[PDB]
Design a binder for these strands. Structure first.
Ligand code: NA
Ligand code: NA
Ligand code: NA
Length: 327
DNA sequence: CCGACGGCGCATAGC
DNA sequence: GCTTATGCGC
DNA sequence: GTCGG
């Protein structure tokens, strides 16, 4: 169900969502508007009343009232006020810079720092992440066509095998589910030498190689298990340069690896289904492990996992191929 | 009625 | 100098 | 803002 069906409603709710996150600083209000918005974008009919949307899980009284207002007037008074408040607009715009959240956005705007230009004048007042966010402002809001993702995977997988045959690297996220575009690149890495009860150089080695073939161009944050940064596919000496992309690389213990892959491959709703079914099948699944659930609810010791299917086997589920994991 | 709503790696005041 | 809390992104 | 114990 595309835009023509309920696009005016879900944009209204999304815009309210962003307002509560970035301005009011009310992340649960933001997540409720997101919840309401996503369930309506599923709904396969044009909504003719707020009461009809109220049937849906996540749409409640106040949103149905807003839905009645928008259906009747074509606008939402509350949102029209927000759009005309210059502080609300500047603060919302600034959070679009990676590294600038509601707190920094409001601080900036309170001292008359409102535009990309203003930030440029005051790079002294930015931390490193935020300067990278400013530098790539437009690039970071572009999507990544799957054919580019496949290229990026080739580069990462081959450079990783180059450092050690024994690494395991998986690109996860919507990409692994067959998605046609990606917002970023999320890479799950492990090595059989690194377990839950056992190096400080295992992630760094891979980040180094990737810098040396000039794939990674910037670092937003790097520790011993999580790397966050920027990359770029190589351009033809003769052709327009590809846009810089966001890449994360996560190093995970080998015995928690396939739970990590299962988790970061998702989707979020599928995760909720698989955990729900597993709970009432006597197991609890989190990011790291699957554990048996006792008759009183006491989780036992983690179960050996040697593949994703191992997790489906434990909970008596037919392997759901990543492309079929939309719910 | 009223608390939960995800939680953690990394970068960056107070002692 | 060392520890903790908080912002941020995911 | 919505939900459910
Ligand atoms: Na409802
Ligand atoms: Na931001
Ligand atoms: Na943002």
């Amino acid at each position: 169900p595309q835009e023509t069906l309920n696009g005016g409603i879900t944009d209204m709710l999304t815009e309210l969502a962003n307002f509560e996150k970035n301005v009011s600083q009310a992340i649960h209000k933001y997540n409720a508007y997101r919840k309401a918005a996503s369930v309506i974008a599923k709904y396969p009919h044009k909504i003719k009343s707020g009461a009809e949307a109220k049937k849906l899980p996540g749409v409640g009284t106040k949103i149905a009232e807003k839905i009645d207002e928008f259906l009747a007037t074509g606008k939402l008074r509350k949102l029209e006020k927000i759009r005309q408040d210059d502080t609300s607009s500047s603060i919302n715009f600034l959070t679009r810079v990676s590294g600038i959240g509601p707190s920094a956005a409001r601080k900036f705007v309170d001292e008359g720092i409102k535009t990309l230009e203003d930030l440029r004048k005051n790079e002294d007042k930015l931390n490193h992440h935020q300067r990278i966010g400013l530098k790539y402002f437009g690039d970071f809001e572009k999507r990544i066509p799957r054919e580019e993702m496949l290229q990026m995977q080739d580069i990462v997988l081959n450079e990783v095998k180059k450092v050690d045959s024994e690494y395991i690297a998986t690109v996860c996220g919507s990409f692994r589910r067959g998605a046609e575009s990606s917002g970023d690149m999320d890479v799950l890495l492990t090595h059989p030498s690194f377990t839950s009860e056992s190096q400080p150089k295992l992630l760094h080695q891979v980040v180094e190689q990737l810098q040396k073939v000039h794939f990674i161009t910037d670092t937003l944050s790097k520790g011993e298990t999580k790397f966050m940064g920027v990359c770029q596919l190589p351009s033809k000496n003769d052709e327009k340069e590809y846009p810089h992309r966001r890449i994360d690389i996560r190093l995970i213990p080998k015995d928690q690896y396939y739970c990590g892959v299962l988790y970061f491959t998702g989707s979020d709703i599928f995760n909720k289904n698989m955990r729900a079914h597993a709970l009432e099948k006597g197991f609890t699944i989190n990011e790291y492990t699957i554990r048996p659930l006792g008759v009183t609810g006491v989780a036992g010791e983690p179960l050996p996992v040697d593949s994703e299917k191992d997790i489906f086997d434990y909970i008596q589920w037919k392997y759901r191929e990543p492309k079929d994991r939309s719910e």
